[PDB]
Amino acid sequence: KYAKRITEWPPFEYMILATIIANCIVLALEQHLPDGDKTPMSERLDDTEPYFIGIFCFEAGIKIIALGFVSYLRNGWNVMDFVVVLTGILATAGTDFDLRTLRAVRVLRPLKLVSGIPSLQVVLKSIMKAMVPLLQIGLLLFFAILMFAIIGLEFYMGKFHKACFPNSTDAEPVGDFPCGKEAPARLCEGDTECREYWPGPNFGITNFDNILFAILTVFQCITMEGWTDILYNTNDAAGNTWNWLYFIPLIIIGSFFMLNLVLGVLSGEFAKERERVENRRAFLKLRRQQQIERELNGYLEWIFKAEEVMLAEEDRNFRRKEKMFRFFIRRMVKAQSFYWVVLCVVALNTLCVAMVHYNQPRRLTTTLYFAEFVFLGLFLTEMSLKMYGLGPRSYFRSSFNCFDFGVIVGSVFEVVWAAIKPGSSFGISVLRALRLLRIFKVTKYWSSLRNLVVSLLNSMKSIISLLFLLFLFIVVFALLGMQLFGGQFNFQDETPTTNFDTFPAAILTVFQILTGEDWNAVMYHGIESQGGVSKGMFSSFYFIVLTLFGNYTLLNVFLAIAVDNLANAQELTKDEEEMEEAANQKLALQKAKEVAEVSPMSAANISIAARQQNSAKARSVWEQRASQLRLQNLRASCEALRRFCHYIVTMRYFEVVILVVIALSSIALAAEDPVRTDSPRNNALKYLDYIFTGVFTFEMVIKMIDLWNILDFIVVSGALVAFAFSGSKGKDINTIKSLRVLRVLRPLKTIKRLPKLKAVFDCVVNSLKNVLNILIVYMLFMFIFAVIAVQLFKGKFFYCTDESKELERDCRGQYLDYEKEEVEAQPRQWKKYDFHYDNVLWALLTLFTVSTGEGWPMVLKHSVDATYEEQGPSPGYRMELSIFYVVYFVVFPFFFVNIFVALIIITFQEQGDKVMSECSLEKNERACIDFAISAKPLTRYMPQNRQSFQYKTWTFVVSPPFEYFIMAMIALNTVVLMMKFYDAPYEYELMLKCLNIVFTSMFSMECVLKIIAFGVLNYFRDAWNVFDFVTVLGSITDILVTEIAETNNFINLSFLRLFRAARLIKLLRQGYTIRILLWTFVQSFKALPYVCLLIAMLFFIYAIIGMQVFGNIALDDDTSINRHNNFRTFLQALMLLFRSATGEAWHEIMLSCLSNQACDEQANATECGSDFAYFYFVSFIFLCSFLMLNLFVAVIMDNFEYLTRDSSILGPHHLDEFIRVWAEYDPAACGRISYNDMFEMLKHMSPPLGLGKKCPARVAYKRLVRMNMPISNEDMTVHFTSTLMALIRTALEIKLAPAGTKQHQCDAELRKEISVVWANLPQKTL
């Protein structure tokens, strides 16, 4: 039994890894066919299973006979291996048919190589240790969903079951939209009536019939996938007046707030983890290695200089004459002239390669073909001459030179491979555009951008491990999907492409679900495959998981990578700059030392050059927090007429009137009718615009007599020109429209007038300027990808209307469309796909749409189906091209976009301080003392009579079992709140109503008991008691309304039910970690309202612009501009803008209004719509994303002190416990309290602060004795003013004990730091 010492060798471990990889390949080679069909390879691979099972069992047996049982089973990975082998053995000996739950375990086999490689185990532990603090967020998220689900269950229960059945002939609805009989809901057209019962919108899956369906629908909504479809279904089922008030708060809270919480928690976790001893040591090693290299390079340059100096004096007096040539070459390959020449050559090559487009002239094609050879030869001659003038070892030292060599080799391979078989092309020749990255060399941003690449290369193994772990999880989920839905997607209609039949299809489906686009469609297909709504509805959980741990795990990989690398680069750059400054000042100070024969002026020179550059120390919040965390960790480790037109603008009440006129003009702009130009409202608006432009020009003309003013000049001049052209016929009506839409800039004038709005706009602009270099790099990478995509896909995105024809000449005439069983004659026409890659601009637009994530499966399908230059598509022709898109998703949406967030997180500047010299010592200590400054020991108001009646009620109410009963009563009432379902029996609804009755009665009894035991003016003091009373009163009003027959049409009262649905909030107070986080983030939100004002102004401006431009588009169904989504009104425009901001079909909306749309039969122009929608939508998406990210980072950095807590010396929270303890023992302040209570209070005090063990109590005595005593005054005196202050002073930054006599200086420091407190603490210092 000595297997461990003779059978646990490296080579045996690599034989077990080969068994696993082979098993993975066998699993990936399986194919699933419907209805029991099987390929011969299926049986051939099935015959391979028992050898794998035998090998696994042998390895398990060796490990058992080496380690024992319950220490071999003590490892979780060994437990997983044992479970896998046991399930395999049972399957081998299993003849019964209930093996599906056992054969689905063999998808965990790829996870076994995680156990075989401990490095992957360490990486997985590191990635999963940052997800525990996210769990509470998920809990909160679940609560939110539950709450919203309940609200849905109370409003949209069985509302989607009505449809326009024509005449009850065969019960086939004509339209897939809900009804309302008369009412403001949507009506049937033609000979149809809305009969009862029709499954629902999506096969009857998305509805609010019961709590489970409501929960699933709300979860689908929060992921912002198809929530607008549900919104429109509610709109046309019950009217559009109040449905937005349910979905807009739902989307906001469930997506934006959750994402902000996740980002903040992750940022705090990363900041805490970066300052650990291991990471700090690794960073110090990297910094030392980088610092050595600069000195080495300087010394080698010095050495080369001497080698070329001792070679000219050695020849001045064959194999030597060829070496001055090498020296001259090396002096030539390093000069600025050669650098600029090669940079211009690379720029010209980029220009030449960027002109490729579909249907280019043959002369241009030949010119580019020859220029490729010319450029390849030139680049080859610049890589050989620079390699001989520097040497192979010195040339390969720089990483970008290695990249250049790789690109040259790939280009040569492409050139030789493009002649022996000219088909498509890889596109490596475009990669030379990355050589433009030399531009940053001549700027001052070279060090910062180079340090990021240095840090990226330093931790390459970690990046590879993380990517491989992600790929392994994707493979495991693909195998699970293959087992669950493999071969079950063969429906009566066309089989969906997004299926789980083969391994490539399953892995593409899993990747698409990970991105989060159209995952609900795949979920619907899976549910339909598993039986439908009736049975098989439990197959959704898979997708649920694949969403959750698929949408918050990438944010834990790529965001972590970005934060770590960018923080490392920033710290490296800052340390390099400060070390250079220190070395320069030391050298200049030493300069004066050698010159002792005269008074030196070097000291003055270094003095005048030491403060001018000092004003560049930004010291962002992230850097300050990192420094404080480093200090704390190190301490813990160690311790173990001109005047008549200028006085009018000087008036105090002149800016306010201008602001109110600006607001009035903005409101008048909002309330405009685009579709009906000729209306009395439009005439009144024109008359008001006359007054507005008159007052604007009047105030403007008196301002020039004494950038933003430039904008005011354009506004005024455009208004004047429009008025001048108004008094004539329609001369150049397009110019009139342009000058009319120019008036939207009126709200922009408010930015300067409000100092706070101007400040926040300046902060946003500064944040934008902070990421300009990364934006340029991102644009260069996107351009390279777009050029490659143009090269790959130009011309191939053409298709005929019917798939039978493959050529343009064949796609002529008419064909038979066999849709909806009508076989209609439809014209054949050779069309082009909406999003293509004809030229670089179209490719850039398509890649932007892909990066946003909308409709990228469609472009993936089109790219895969593309065949040739002028030939129609063929399904699955080139599947490998999907790699391209995968790579794109790895680089832009995932990587590049996550380094934008990090670059804003780590460089965010504090705004509420605006100065770094306030106290230089307190960041949380100041807040900790201010908490005691403001929070007085508020009491619980114990009754003072206690004679016969009030004391009994008070004792009953404040009793712990009463609170427990209320909690159980509030938790059991929520169980009866979600237990309602559609088409329930009458007795069931009666029981539900009776239970609601008794619960409301119990809560009313509790409220009246509290009123009696506390008092009218005491119960209402609490903000929670008044909320409870409001909910009780609302429930009573609802129950009274319900008992009496409801007013059918007099007053529509159905909102009061929400009050009862509010009881959930009543149970939100039990959690001691969700309340303190929710309240903290809400209080940070309420402290930054001007960011929200800026976002609202952005939405207002874009809504007005859309109203003016695309307002009169004709409403048509089966499009993106219809009765649900249009630009007609201000509310409709805002809804469209919000839908695009979340992102549903913004590309489809853009295409639905481009310069050729059929125009409404009520407006003036017969052809309305413009090609301006491209810029409109792209700019709106970019700006909305940027401002939302800025708001998120502002909120996160407002709370960074709490998000990086490291809770062991916490002070902001222990004061709450102190107040809670003091309140119970104190009925009222009464000035002063006794002494003996404080000892039992310290005993009952939280052990985290004050006493850990029995021994530290002595230290507490050392804090009570051996210093100044408050016993000088009356012993009947409070001590909280002197106890908590002393404990918070001595817990951190203790100074009195080492001195023992310098108390007066500490008191003076405290006084000068509390200078303006209105002398309130002077009486508390004693």
Ligand SMILES: CCCCCCCCCCCCCCCCCC(=O)OC[C@H](COP(=O)(O)OCCN)OC(=O)CCCCCCCCCCCCCCCCC
């Ligand atoms: C940590 C998680 C915290 C979660 C907090 C959640 C906060 C947001 C909650 C949003 C709830 C308000 C929106 C209600 C959705 C309205 C749905 C609807 O269609 O209502 C119409 C309804 C009658 O339907 P109607 O079509 O008019 O008639 C035919 C069919 N009966 O009724 C009507 O006739 C109109 C009445 C509905 C519109 C007004 C309702 C009051 C809204 C006040 C503002 C929000 C109050 C928030 C209260 C929080 C606690 C619930």
Ligand SMILES: CC(C)CCC[C@@H](C)[C@H]1CC[C@H]2[C@@H]3CC=C4C[C@@H](OC(=O)CCC(=O)O)CC[C@]4(C)[C@H]3CC[C@]12C
């Ligand atoms: C990286 C730097 C050096 C590139 C600078 C920009 C140009 C190289 C790009 C930007 C605009 C691109 C143009 C974008 C739009 C067009 C129009 C296009 O012309 C046609 O499509 C005519 C055929 C037809 O539609 O019938 C030819 C490509 C061209 C000029 C592109 C050629 C390459 C251009 C000129």
Ligand SMILES: CC(C)CCC[C@@H](C)[C@H]1CC[C@H]2[C@@H]3CC=C4C[C@@H](OC(=O)CCC(=O)O)CC[C@]4(C)[C@H]3CC[C@]12C
């Ligand atoms: C300062 C910002 C928030 C813009 C103003 C807020 C808007 C949401 C409010 C303020 C004025 C409201 C407008 C107040 C007056 C009207 C006119 C109203 O139409 C009619 O009065 C019917 C008369 C006719 O049929 O001609 C339509 C709503 C509308 C523009 C309202 C739409 C919503 C508006 C634009």
Ligand SMILES: CC(C)CCC[C@@H](C)[C@H]1CC[C@H]2[C@@H]3CC=C4C[C@@H](OC(=O)CCC(=O)O)CC[C@]4(C)[C@H]3CC[C@]12C
């Ligand atoms: C963090 C990353 C690594 C996640 C994705 C891992 C990729 C390597 C996966 C996801 C997409 C997979 C691709 C999904 C689709 C295809 C096409 C397909 O190629 C075929 O020729 C299929 C053959 C057939 O038609 O039956 C299989 C390889 C490839 C690119 C797969 C290879 C492995 C890929 C590239």
Ligand SMILES: CC(C)CCC[C@@H](C)[C@H]1CC[C@H]2[C@@H]3CC=C4C[C@@H](O)CC[C@]4(C)[C@H]3CC[C@]12C
């Ligand atoms: C001073 C501004 C900012 C506030 C007042 C502007 C809005 C509320 C005013 C300006 C002109 C007004 C319109 C003038 C004419 C008509 C025609 C008729 O159908 C009655 C209502 C209606 C449609 C008015 C509704 C209210 C209206 C749109």
Ligand SMILES: CC(C)CCC[C@@H](C)[C@H]1CC[C@H]2[C@@H]3CC=C4C[C@@H](O)CC[C@]4(C)[C@H]3CC[C@]12C
């Ligand atoms: C790291 C950054 C700069 C990405 C640069 C590499 C990109 C452009 C490379 C990496 C892998 C490459 C793909 C690899 C394989 C194929 C299959 C071939 O039949 C067509 C080209 C295609 C689809 C390539 C296109 C270009 C591609 C996506």
Ligand SMILES: CC(C)CCC[C@@H](C)[C@H]1CC[C@H]2[C@@H]3CC=C4C[C@@H](O)CC[C@]4(C)[C@H]3CC[C@]12C
């Ligand atoms: C906390 C959980 C476990 C118990 C409280 C949840 C109760 C109220 C929920 C959980 C699952 C729900 C059931 C889920 C499915 C159905 C089938 C439907 O055709 C009638 C309603 C019915 C029977 C639901 C009634 C309410 C229900 C029982």
Ligand SMILES: CC(C)CCC[C@@H](C)[C@H]1CC[C@H]2[C@@H]3CC=C4C[C@@H](O)CC[C@]4(C)[C@H]3CC[C@]12C
């Ligand atoms: C002025 C600001 C928005 C700078 C952005 C300018 C560019 C991106 C925008 C501003 C106005 C736009 C124009 C507005 C209207 C039309 C008419 C249409 O039939 C063809 C396109 C064309 C000519 C647009 C092209 C793009 C355009 C020039």
Ligand SMILES: *[C@@H]1O[C@H](CO)[C@@H](O)[C@H](O)[C@H]1NC(C)=O
């Ligand atoms: C069937 O249609 C006719 C007219 O097409 C109309 O009377 C009604 O909708 C139906 N007739 C019935 C229900 O008798």
Ligand SMILES: [Ca+2]
């Ligand atoms: Ca979407």
